[PDB]
Enzyme design. Sequence first.
Site, PDB file in Angstrom:
ATOM      1  N   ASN B 308       0.839  -1.189   0.000  1.00  0.00           N
ATOM      2  CA  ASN B 308       0.000   0.000   0.000  1.00  0.00           C
ATOM      3  C   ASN B 308       0.882   1.249   0.000  1.00  0.00           C
ATOM      4  N   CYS B 310       1.756   3.558   2.132  1.00  0.00           N
ATOM      5  CA  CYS B 310       2.709   3.845   3.213  1.00  0.00           C
ATOM      6  C   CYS B 310       3.653   2.679   3.495  1.00  0.00           C
ATOM      7  N   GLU B 312       3.398  -0.274   4.810  1.00  0.00           N
ATOM      8  CA  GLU B 312       3.298  -1.175   5.962  1.00  0.00           C
ATOM      9  C   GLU B 312       2.609  -2.516   5.677  1.00  0.00           C
TER      10      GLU B 312
HETATM   11  C1  B12 Z   1       0.816  10.204   8.234  1.00  0.00           C
HETATM   12  C2  B12 Z   1       1.966  11.034   7.548  1.00  0.00           C
HETATM   13  C3  B12 Z   1       2.068  11.112   6.194  1.00  0.00           C
HETATM   14  C4  B12 Z   1       0.963  10.713   5.239  1.00  0.00           C
HETATM   15  C5  B12 Z   1      -0.329  11.605   5.593  1.00  0.00           C
HETATM   16  C6  B12 Z   1      -1.605  10.897   5.350  1.00  0.00           C
HETATM   17  C7  B12 Z   1      -1.800   9.706   6.293  1.00  0.00           C
HETATM   18  N1  B12 Z   1      -1.091   8.578   6.017  1.00  0.00           N
HETATM   19  O1  B12 Z   1      -2.582   9.777   7.250  1.00  0.00           O
HETATM   20  C8  B12 Z   1       1.692  10.664   3.882  1.00  0.00           C
HETATM   21  C9  B12 Z   1       1.872   9.333   3.199  1.00  0.00           C
HETATM   22  C10 B12 Z   1       0.913  11.601   2.908  1.00  0.00           C
HETATM   23  C11 B12 Z   1       3.010  11.373   4.194  1.00  0.00           C
HETATM   24  C12 B12 Z   1       3.928  11.723   3.217  1.00  0.00           C
HETATM   25  C13 B12 Z   1       5.142  12.362   3.420  1.00  0.00           C
HETATM   26  N2  B12 Z   1       5.646  12.748   4.599  1.00  0.00           N
HETATM   27 CO1  B12 Z   1       4.661  12.551   6.232  1.00  0.00          CO
HETATM   28  N3  B12 Z   1       3.873  12.423   7.922  1.00  0.00           N
HETATM   29  C14 B12 Z   1       2.906  11.718   8.416  1.00  0.00           C
HETATM   30  C15 B12 Z   1       2.878  11.745   9.959  1.00  0.00           C
HETATM   31  C16 B12 Z   1       3.342  10.375  10.515  1.00  0.00           C
HETATM   32  C17 B12 Z   1       1.493  12.137  10.549  1.00  0.00           C
HETATM   33  C18 B12 Z   1       1.221  13.637  10.485  1.00  0.00           C
HETATM   34  C19 B12 Z   1      -0.267  13.966  10.563  1.00  0.00           C
HETATM   35  O2  B12 Z   1      -1.071  13.624   9.702  1.00  0.00           O
HETATM   36  N4  B12 Z   1      -0.608  14.678  11.654  1.00  0.00           N
HETATM   37  C20 B12 Z   1      -1.987  14.797  12.073  1.00  0.00           C
HETATM   38  C21 B12 Z   1      -2.928  15.433  11.048  1.00  0.00           C
HETATM   39  C22 B12 Z   1      -4.384  15.242  11.474  1.00  0.00           C
HETATM   40  O3  B12 Z   1      -2.672  16.873  11.011  1.00  0.00           O
HETATM   41  P1  B12 Z   1      -2.256  17.564   9.653  1.00  0.00           P
HETATM   42  O4  B12 Z   1      -1.361  18.719   9.947  1.00  0.00           O
HETATM   43  O5  B12 Z   1      -3.461  17.858   8.843  1.00  0.00           O
HETATM   44  O6  B12 Z   1      -1.368  16.419   8.943  1.00  0.00           O
HETATM   45  C23 B12 Z   1      -1.063  16.610   7.561  1.00  0.00           C
HETATM   46  C24 B12 Z   1       0.402  16.987   7.318  1.00  0.00           C
HETATM   47  O7  B12 Z   1       1.217  16.369   8.284  1.00  0.00           O
HETATM   48  C25 B12 Z   1       0.631  16.321   5.932  1.00  0.00           C
HETATM   49  N5  B12 Z   1       1.989  15.815   5.750  1.00  0.00           N
HETATM   50  C26 B12 Z   1       2.392  14.525   5.992  1.00  0.00           C
HETATM   51  N6  B12 Z   1       3.681  14.331   5.755  1.00  0.00           N
HETATM   52  C27 B12 Z   1       4.157  15.566   5.329  1.00  0.00           C
HETATM   53  C28 B12 Z   1       5.447  15.941   4.941  1.00  0.00           C
HETATM   54  C29 B12 Z   1       5.671  17.259   4.553  1.00  0.00           C
HETATM   55  C30 B12 Z   1       6.992  17.652   4.154  1.00  0.00           C
HETATM   56  C31 B12 Z   1       4.558  18.242   4.549  1.00  0.00           C
HETATM   57  C32 B12 Z   1       4.805  19.665   4.129  1.00  0.00           C
HETATM   58  C33 B12 Z   1       3.279  17.844   4.940  1.00  0.00           C
HETATM   59  C34 B12 Z   1       3.101  16.508   5.324  1.00  0.00           C
HETATM   60  O8  B12 Z   1      -0.274  15.254   5.747  1.00  0.00           O
HETATM   61  C35 B12 Z   1      -1.245  15.333   6.780  1.00  0.00           C
HETATM   62  C36 B12 Z   1      -2.691  15.111   6.366  1.00  0.00           C
HETATM   63  O9  B12 Z   1      -2.820  13.927   5.719  1.00  0.00           O
HETATM   64  C37 B12 Z   1       3.891  12.872  10.334  1.00  0.00           C
HETATM   65  C38 B12 Z   1       4.813  12.539  11.516  1.00  0.00           C
HETATM   66  C39 B12 Z   1       4.424  13.369  12.729  1.00  0.00           C
HETATM   67  N7  B12 Z   1       5.139  13.173  13.823  1.00  0.00           N
HETATM   68  O10 B12 Z   1       3.487  14.166  12.661  1.00  0.00           O
HETATM   69  C40 B12 Z   1       4.557  13.168   8.986  1.00  0.00           C
HETATM   70  C41 B12 Z   1       5.688  14.087   8.500  1.00  0.00           C
HETATM   71  C42 B12 Z   1       5.107  15.521   8.375  1.00  0.00           C
HETATM   72  N8  B12 Z   1       6.000  13.515   7.147  1.00  0.00           N
HETATM   73  C43 B12 Z   1       7.249  13.724   6.829  1.00  0.00           C
HETATM   74  C44 B12 Z   1       7.800  13.473   5.510  1.00  0.00           C
HETATM   75  C45 B12 Z   1       9.278  13.761   5.333  1.00  0.00           C
HETATM   76  C46 B12 Z   1       7.014  13.025   4.475  1.00  0.00           C
HETATM   77  C47 B12 Z   1       7.455  12.744   3.015  1.00  0.00           C
HETATM   78  C48 B12 Z   1       8.390  13.783   2.360  1.00  0.00           C
HETATM   79  C49 B12 Z   1       8.085  11.325   2.929  1.00  0.00           C
HETATM   80  C50 B12 Z   1       8.128  10.673   1.551  1.00  0.00           C
HETATM   81  N9  B12 Z   1       8.443   9.384   1.524  1.00  0.00           N
HETATM   82  O11 B12 Z   1       7.892  11.301   0.534  1.00  0.00           O
HETATM   83  C51 B12 Z   1       6.068  12.703   2.291  1.00  0.00           C
HETATM   84  C52 B12 Z   1       5.649  14.035   1.636  1.00  0.00           C
HETATM   85  C53 B12 Z   1       4.598  13.847   0.524  1.00  0.00           C
HETATM   86  C54 B12 Z   1       4.191  15.236   0.036  1.00  0.00           C
HETATM   87  N10 B12 Z   1       3.348  15.274  -0.996  1.00  0.00           N
HETATM   88  O12 B12 Z   1       4.633  16.239   0.582  1.00  0.00           O
HETATM   89  C55 B12 Z   1       8.041  14.313   7.984  1.00  0.00           C
HETATM   90  C56 B12 Z   1       8.414  15.797   7.692  1.00  0.00           C
HETATM   91  C57 B12 Z   1       9.683  16.321   8.387  1.00  0.00           C
HETATM   92  C58 B12 Z   1       9.843  17.812   8.136  1.00  0.00           C
HETATM   93  N11 B12 Z   1      11.077  18.304   8.192  1.00  0.00           N
HETATM   94  O13 B12 Z   1       8.852  18.518   7.877  1.00  0.00           O
HETATM   95  C59 B12 Z   1       7.096  14.025   9.198  1.00  0.00           C
HETATM   96  C60 B12 Z   1       7.208  15.051  10.340  1.00  0.00           C
HETATM   97  C61 B12 Z   1       7.394  12.547   9.670  1.00  0.00           C
HETATM   98  C62 B12 Z   1       8.830  12.188  10.065  1.00  0.00           C
HETATM   99  N12 B12 Z   1       8.999  10.995  10.644  1.00  0.00           N
HETATM  100  O14 B12 Z   1       9.773  12.942   9.864  1.00  0.00           O
HETATM  101  N13 B12 Z   1       3.158  11.615   5.495  1.00  0.00           N
HETATM  102  N1  LIG Z   2      -6.869   7.342  -0.291  1.00  0.00           N
HETATM  103  C1  LIG Z   2      -6.247   7.650   0.873  1.00  0.00           C
HETATM  104  N2  LIG Z   2      -5.729   6.647   1.641  1.00  0.00           N
HETATM  105  C2  LIG Z   2      -5.095   6.917   2.810  1.00  0.00           C
HETATM  106  C3  LIG Z   2      -4.979   8.322   3.230  1.00  0.00           C
HETATM  107  N3  LIG Z   2      -4.321   8.332   4.405  1.00  0.00           N
HETATM  108  C4  LIG Z   2      -4.038   7.044   4.716  1.00  0.00           C
HETATM  109  N4  LIG Z   2      -4.498   6.200   3.773  1.00  0.00           N
HETATM  110  C5  LIG Z   2      -4.337   4.728   3.828  1.00  0.00           C
HETATM  111  O1  LIG Z   2      -4.163   4.341   5.196  1.00  0.00           O
HETATM  112  C6  LIG Z   2      -2.828   3.875   5.428  1.00  0.00           C
HETATM  113  C7  LIG Z   2      -2.247   4.523   6.684  1.00  0.00           C
HETATM  114  O2  LIG Z   2      -3.174   5.474   7.216  1.00  0.00           O
HETATM  115  P1  LIG Z   2      -3.051   6.036   8.733  1.00  0.00           P
HETATM  116  O3  LIG Z   2      -2.495   7.439   8.735  1.00  0.00           O
HETATM  117  O4  LIG Z   2      -2.198   5.085   9.533  1.00  0.00           O
HETATM  118  O5  LIG Z   2      -4.592   5.960   9.203  1.00  0.00           O
HETATM  119  P2  LIG Z   2      -5.524   7.176   9.719  1.00  0.00           P
HETATM  120  O6  LIG Z   2      -4.930   7.864  10.938  1.00  0.00           O
HETATM  121  O7  LIG Z   2      -6.844   6.518  10.059  1.00  0.00           O
HETATM  122  O8  LIG Z   2      -5.752   8.211   8.640  1.00  0.00           O
HETATM  123  C8  LIG Z   2      -2.028   4.226   4.183  1.00  0.00           C
HETATM  124  O9  LIG Z   2      -1.075   3.207   3.878  1.00  0.00           O
HETATM  125  C9  LIG Z   2      -3.071   4.339   3.094  1.00  0.00           C
HETATM  126  O10 LIG Z   2      -3.268   3.060   2.491  1.00  0.00           O
HETATM  127  C10 LIG Z   2      -5.564   9.352   2.343  1.00  0.00           C
HETATM  128  O11 LIG Z   2      -5.493  10.562   2.651  1.00  0.00           O
HETATM  129  N5  LIG Z   2      -6.166   8.949   1.216  1.00  0.00           N
END
Ligand code: B12
Ligand SMILES: Nc1nc2c(ncn2[C@@H]2O[C@H](COP(=O)(O)OP(=O)(O)O)[C@@H](O)[C@H]2O)c(=O)[nH]1
Lengths: 618, 612
Positions: B308, B310, B312
Amino acid sequence: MKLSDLISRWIDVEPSKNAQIILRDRYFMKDLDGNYLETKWEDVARRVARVVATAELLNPSYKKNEKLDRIKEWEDIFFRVLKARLFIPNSPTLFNAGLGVKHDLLWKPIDQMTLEDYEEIYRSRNHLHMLSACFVVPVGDSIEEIFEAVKEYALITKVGGGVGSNFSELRPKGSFVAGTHGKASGPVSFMHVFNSAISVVKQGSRRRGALMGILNINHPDIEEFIDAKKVLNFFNLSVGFPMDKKEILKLYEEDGELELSHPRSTIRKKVKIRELFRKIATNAWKSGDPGLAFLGEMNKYYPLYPHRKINSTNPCGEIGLSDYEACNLGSIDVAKFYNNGFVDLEALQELVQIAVRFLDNVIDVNVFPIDKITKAVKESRRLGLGIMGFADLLYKLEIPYNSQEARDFAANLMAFIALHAHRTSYELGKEKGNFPLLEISRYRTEDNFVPFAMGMSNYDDEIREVMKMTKEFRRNVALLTIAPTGSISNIADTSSGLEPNFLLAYTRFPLLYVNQVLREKLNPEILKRIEKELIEKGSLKDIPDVPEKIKKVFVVALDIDPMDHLLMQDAFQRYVDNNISKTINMPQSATVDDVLNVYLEALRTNVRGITVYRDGSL
Amino acid sequence: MKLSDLISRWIDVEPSKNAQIILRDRYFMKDLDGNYLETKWEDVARRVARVVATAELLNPSKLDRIKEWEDIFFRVLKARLFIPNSPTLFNAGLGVKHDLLWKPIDQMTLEDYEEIYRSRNHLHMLSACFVVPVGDSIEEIFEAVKEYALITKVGGGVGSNFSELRPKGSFVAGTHGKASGPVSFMHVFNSAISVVKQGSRRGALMGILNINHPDIEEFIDAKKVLNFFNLSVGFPMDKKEILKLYEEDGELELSHPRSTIRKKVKIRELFRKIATNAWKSGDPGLAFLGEMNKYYPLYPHRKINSTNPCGEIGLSDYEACNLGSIDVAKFYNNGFVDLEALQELVQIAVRFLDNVIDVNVFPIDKITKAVKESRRLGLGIMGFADLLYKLEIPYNSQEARDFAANLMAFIALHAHRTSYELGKEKGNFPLLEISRYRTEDNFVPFAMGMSNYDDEIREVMKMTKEFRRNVALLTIAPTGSISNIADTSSGLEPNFLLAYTRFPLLYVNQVLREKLNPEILKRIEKELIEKGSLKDIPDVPEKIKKVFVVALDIDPMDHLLMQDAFQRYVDNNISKTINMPQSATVDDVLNVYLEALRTNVRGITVYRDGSL
Ligand code: B12
Ligand SMILES: Nc1nc2c(ncn2[C@@H]2O[C@H](COP(=O)(O)OP(=O)(O)O)[C@@H](O)[C@H]2O)c(=O)[nH]1
Ligand code: B12
Ligand SMILES: Cc1cn([C@H]2C[C@H](O)[C@@H](COP(=O)(O)OP(=O)(O)OP(=O)(O)O)O2)c(=O)[nH]c1=O
Ligand SMILES: Cc1cn([C@H]2C[C@H](O)[C@@H](COP(=O)(O)OP(=O)(O)OP(=O)(O)O)O2)c(=O)[nH]c1=O
Ligand SMILES: Nc1nc2c(ncn2[C@@H]2O[C@H](COP(=O)(O)OP(=O)(O)O)[C@@H](O)[C@H]2O)c(=O)[nH]1
Ligand SMILES: C[C@H]1O[C@@H](n2cnc3c(N)ncnc32)[C@H](O)[C@@H]1O
Ligand SMILES: C[C@H]1O[C@@H](n2cnc3c(N)ncnc32)[C@H](O)[C@@H]1O
Ligand SMILES: [Mg+2]
Ligand SMILES: [Mg+2]
C-alpha cells in the site's frame, strides 16, 4: 458511358509519386519483421476487394451452388473500381482488411479462389480487423461510467478509430457529490483524463483531432468549455445545440437570456445568448475552436428519433451518431466522371450502386472492439457514402466555385447520388434483409419522411417517391456524408471532399504539387512564367498576363468569401442524410462580428454544423 | 489492573480541543443536507461499535451475545484505548437508517441488527489500503485505471507494481508500434486520481518498479508530474543476493520477458542513483518484496508484488487490509506496562478487526474474494514514544529497542493466539490448507530473535496448523489521524517535536509537562520551540535531555534498528521514516541502505531534514 468503360480510362493511370509515398508509408501491408507484403496500389485493391466481397457468403438469396460465381463477380467489380480509384473507402478499411488471414489467400488470383478459400478468409479475421473511421460513446454522470468510457477511448484508438462524446451528462464543476459530500470536478476536468489516456496510445502515431468533445450551450460550465484550449491537444471541441436552430436564432434576434442548468446540480445561471455567442466567435476568431454542432437539426432528420438520439458527432463532425454507433465511410472521386463538358451520369449511377453495396458489405466483415458497438452497427447499418474531387470537377467544367451556378450544380449532383444510393438501399433490403430497426423508424411510422431538406433540385419528387418505397424495404438507416477525405483524396490524386482547392501550387514535406487541371487548361508558356508568383502569392488573383477566364475558374479557398463557402455547404446538406465536413475559410482581416454573421447565416440555412478558420489566426 | 478498571480511568476523559477540531472536520457524520448527526466523539464510538458487532450474526457458534460485543467495542472505542483505521470511522453505518445507529442499546432488537447488516450500501468501505495488478495490455492497464478511481472514490489508497508493463520503445505487435513504458502509463493513473476525492490526497498511491526493469533509471528520476504517487524500487530477489552483488561490485542485467530491450549496469551505480534522488526529495524508497514473500504463508501459490502507499502492508493481487491501533501510552502504570489489561484488549482488537471484514463492502468483486479467502488483519500500536517518556526510556537506546521487541512479541503472541480461538469458533480462513502453517513444519511469519517470548510463539504457530482465522495479523501503520484522535504520539515514531504552536494556542508534550519543573518550562519553552529539541538548551537536567529526545535528536542508525526490533515480531510490514540530518551526504544515505540489507526490515523510507 458504361462504368466498365470509364473504369478502362482510369484503371492503368498510376498513382503520383506523392500518392505512392503515402501508400508505402502507411497503407502497404507488412509482416511482423517490417517486410512489405504489398508494393503497389494494385495489391491493396486486390486485398480489400477480396475481403469485402467475402461478405457475400452471408447473402441469403444466393443458393450455395452459385455463391462462388457471385462472390467472385463482386470481388472483380470491387477490385476494378478500387484500382481505378473511382471509389475508395475510409483509411481503416485499407489498413486493416485481411488482418488475421493467411497471406497466401489475400492476393491469390481470383480465378483460383474456391468457396473454401472465401470461408477461410471470413473465419480468420482477427480482433484488429476494424474497418470503420470512428465511433461515438456515451459518458455517464458517475465515476464508474466515466472511467469505463476512458477505457473505451483507449480500446477504440488502439485499433485505429476516432471517438466523439457529448460530455454534457457530467454535472457542473462544484456540484454536490452525494457519495462523498464532496464537489464534482465537472466535464472539463474529466476531459483532461480522456486526453491523457490518448497520449499513451498510438496506431500509430499521428493522432491530431482523434477525439471530438461536445458540451451543450446550456450547460453551467459552457463558458469554461468555450475557453478550454487557450492540454486538450487530441480533442476537437464543438458547442452542442440540442434545441431547434430556429429557437436559438429567435433568442439571439430578441436579445434573450438562456438558462444554464443541469438536472443533477443546484448550480443555475442566466446569460445573454448574444454575449455567449460573442465569446464563442471570439475564441473561434483566435484559434478556430470551438465549432458549432446543431444536434437538434440532426435529430429532426434522424429516422430513429426520439426512440434513439444523436448527442454527438465523430471528430470531424460529418456523422451524427447515436451511442456506440460507427462511421462506415467511403468516397467517389467525381472528377473522374467528367466527360466532354458533362458529368457521366450513366457511369455515376452504376458506381453509386456498387459503392453502397461495398460499404454495406464492410459492416459484415468488420470486427469491433466493444460488444455494444457491434450491436448498434448491426441494428441500424448506417453508411457514409461521400464524394471527393468536387473542386477539380468544377475546374474541368469551367465553373467558378464561388457562383450560384456551382451551388446549383452541387445540389443537383448530390440529389442524384442520394436518389440512387437510397434506391440501392431499398434493393439491398429486398435482397438481404431490412435493418432490424426499420419497423420502428420514421420511414415506417410517418408519412412523407425525408432525411434531408431538399428544395434545390429537379430530383425532389423522385426522391420523395423512393423514400416512400423504403417504408417496405431498406437496408440502411442513412447512407450519405461528405468527409474531409484528407488521406484518401491524396491516394486518388484529386481535390478533397467538397472543399475548394486550398492552393494551386505548393511544396510539401519535398516535392511541389501543381494542380493537374490547371496544367491542362493554362498555356504551358504562361505557367512556367507565373509558377514562381503563384506559389508565393497562393492565388492567381493578382497576377498579370493570366487570362481573366482562368482566374475566375481556378479560385482557391481564400479567393472565395465566407458566405460562398457556407452556401456551398448548404447546397450539399440539402441532399445529405448525415452531415458534412466543411471549413468556412475567412480572410485575416475578418472581425469577430464577421464570425457572428456567419453563425447567424448558418442558423437560417440547412447546415447541421459549422467550423470556421481565420487565415493567420493560429 | 484488568481492562475494565483501565477503561474507567479513560472512558470519561474528553478529547482535546485539538482533537475535537479533527472530528468536527471530517469524522462526525452529517446529513446530505449538511446537518450534524454526530456532535461528540462518543456518538462515533456508538455507531462503529454497533456496526462491527453485527458481524456476530454470522457466528455459527444470540441477541445477548451481539449486544455483549457492542458494549465492549463501545467502551474501548470511547476511552480511545484502540481505534480502527479512518475509513472505518468515516464509513461505518453508511446506508443504514439513522434510527438504528444511535438509539439506546437496551432498546435494540434482533430485528434491528439484521436490518443494519442488510442495508449496508456500496459506500460501506471500511479498509485503508488496496493492491491491484496492472497487466501488460491496454485492456488491463485501463481496467486498472478504473479500479484506482473506484477505490479512491470510497476512501481507499491503492498500490501497484508496474513491472509487467514492457519497457519504453518495445515492440507492440497489434499496431507494429512502440510501447509507451511504465512511467508514461503512471502519468495516466495520476491524472485519474487528480479528478477523484472522498472530500479532498497526498500519497494516495504506491507505484513500484522492480530493480531489474529496463526503465528503472527513468523511474528513479521520475519525480524531478506524479504528485499522488509514493514511489519505491522493488527487490523481488533475496536481500542477501543484492548485498552480495553490491559488495562484489557486480553487474545487474536489465531485462523484460516481453521486450528484446536489455542492458548491463553496475549495481553500485543504480544504488547511488536511488540514494541521490532520495537525498534530494525523499523518493523513491526500497521495497524488499522478496523478504515479504519469505514470510508470506501462501508463497508461492500466491505472491506479494506490492505494498500500500505507506508500505506497511505487503499485499498479493486484490487484497486489502483493515488496520486498527492500540494506544500503548494509556497502558502505563507504576513504571510498568500493564500486561494484564493489554492482553485482553488484544484479543478484543483481533476480534474487532476480523469482524470488520464481515461487514465490509468492497468496490470490486475480485477484492471481496481476496479479502475473504485470507482474512489478513493489520493490528498495530500508537503512543509508543509517549510510553517511553513515561517509562523514562531514551528512544535512541538499546533499552528502548529491547522493550519494543518485548512489547511487540507479547502482542504477536496473544494476537496469533486469539486467531486460533476465533478460527476454532468461526472457521479457518479458506486457504489455511494450502498455507505454510500446514504444509511445512516450523514456519514462522517473522524473524523473532529478540525476546524470551520466542519459544511460546513457536508453539502457538504450531497449534495454528489446525485452527487459524487469519493469514497474518500485525502491522505498524503511521496512524497520522487516529493518533491525534487518541491524543497520543503516532505509530512507533519518536515525537517529531515537543513543542509547537496550533493556531495561537501553544502546545507542549503532555508528558514532558509532568516530569519537568513548571518554572523551568516557562523559561525554556522559548528556546525549545526555536531549536526543536532540548539537547543544547542551558540548564536542563541531563536525564530530561536524554529521555525527551525527538526525531532529529535520534540518528539514522538508531531509527533503523528501532524498525528492526519491531519488524522481528510483525508478520506484515512497518511504516517508519528514517530521518537524517540536513548535513547528511548521499554516502550517509547509502550506508543506511547497506545496513538495511543486513537487518530484518522489509522496506526503507528515508527523509533528509530540510531537503524539501
Ligand atoms: C501520516 C503522515 C504522512 C501521510 C499523511 C496521510 C496519512 N497517512 O494519514 C503521507 C503518506 C501523505 C506522508 C507523506 C510524506 N511525509 Co509525512 N507524515 C505523516 C505523519 C506520521 C502524521 C502527520 C499527521 O497527519 N498529523 C496529524 C494530522 C491530522 O494533522 P495535519 O497537519 O493535517 O497532517 C497533515 C500533514 O502532516 C501532511 N503531511 C504529511 N507528511 C508531510 C510531509 C511534509 C513535508 C509536509 C509539508 C506535509 C506533510 O499530511 C497530513 C494530512 O494527511 C507525520 C509525523 C508526525 N510526527 O506528525 C509526517 C511528516 C510531516 N511527514 C514527513 C515526511 C518527510 C514526508 C514525506 C516527504 C516522505 C516521503 N516518503 O515522501 C512525504 C511528503 C509527501 C508530500 N506530498 O509532501 C516528515 C516531515 C519532516 C519535516 N522536516 O517537515 C514528518 C514530520 C514525519 C517524520 N517521521 O519525519 N506523510
Ligand atoms: N486514499 C487515501 N488513503 C489513505 C490516506 N491516508 C491514509 N491512507 C491509507 O491508510 C494507510 C495509513 O493510514 P493512517 O495514517 O495510519 O490511518 P488514519 O490515521 O486513520 O488516517 C495508508 O497506507 C493508506 O493506504 C488518504 O489521505 N487517502
Ligand atoms: C483532414 C484534415 C484534418 C484532420 C486530419 C485527420 C483526418 N481526419 O484526416 C484533422 C481533424 C486532424 C484536422 C484538424 C484541424 N485542421 Co485540418 N485539414 C484537413 C485537410 C482537409 C486534409 C489534410 C490531409 O490529410 N492532407 C493529406 C495528408 C496525407 O497530408 P499530411 O501532410 O499528412 O496532412 C497532415 C496535416 O495537414 C495535418 N493538419 C490537418 N489540419 C491541420 C491544421 C493545421 C493548422 C496544421 C498546422 C496541420 C494540420 O494533419 C494531417 C495528417 O493527418 C486539410 C485541407 C487541405 N487542403 O489539405 C486541412 C487543413 C490543413 N486544416 C485546417 C485547419 C484550420 C484545421 C483546424 C485548426 C480546424 C479546427 N476546427 O480547429 C484543426 C487543427 C488541429 C490542431 N491540433 O492543430 C486548415 C489550415 C489552413 C492553413 N492556413 O494552415 C486546412 C488547410 C483546411 C482549410 N480549408 O483551411 N484537419
Ligand atoms: C465520486 C466523485 C464524483 N465526481 C463527479 C463524477 C460524476 O460526474 C459525478 C457523480 O459521481 P458518482 O460516481 O455518481 O458519485 P455518487 O454516486 O457517489 O454520488 P451521486 O449520488 O451524487 O451520483 O460527480 C467527482 O468529480 N469526484 C468524485 O470524487
Ligand atoms: C496499443 C499500445 C500498447 N502499448 C503498450 C501497453 C502494454 O504495456 C503493451 C501491450 O499492449 P497491448 O494492448 O496488449 O498490445 P497488443 O496485444 O496489440 O500487442 P502485443 O501482442 O505485442 O501485446 O504495449 C502502448 O504503449 N501503446 C500502444 O499504442
Ligand atoms: N484516431 C484517428 N482517427 C482519424 C484520424 N483521421 C481521421 N480519423 C477518422 O476519420 C474521419 C475523417 O477522416 P478523413 O480525412 O475523411 O479520412 P481519410 O481520408 O481516410 O484519412 C475523422 O473524423 C475521424 O473520425 C486520425 O488521425 N486519428
Ligand atoms: C480541417 C478539418 O478539420 C475538421 N474539424 C476540425 N475541428 C472540427 C470541429 N470542431 N467540428 C467538425 N470538424 C472539425 C473539419 O471537418 C475539417 O475537414
Ligand atoms: C510519513 C509516512 O510516509 C510514508 N511513505 C512515504 N513514501 C513512502 C514510500 N515511498 N514507501 C513507504 N512509505 C512511504 C512512510 O511510511 C511514513 O510513515
Ligand atoms: Mg452514481
Ligand atoms: Mg497484448
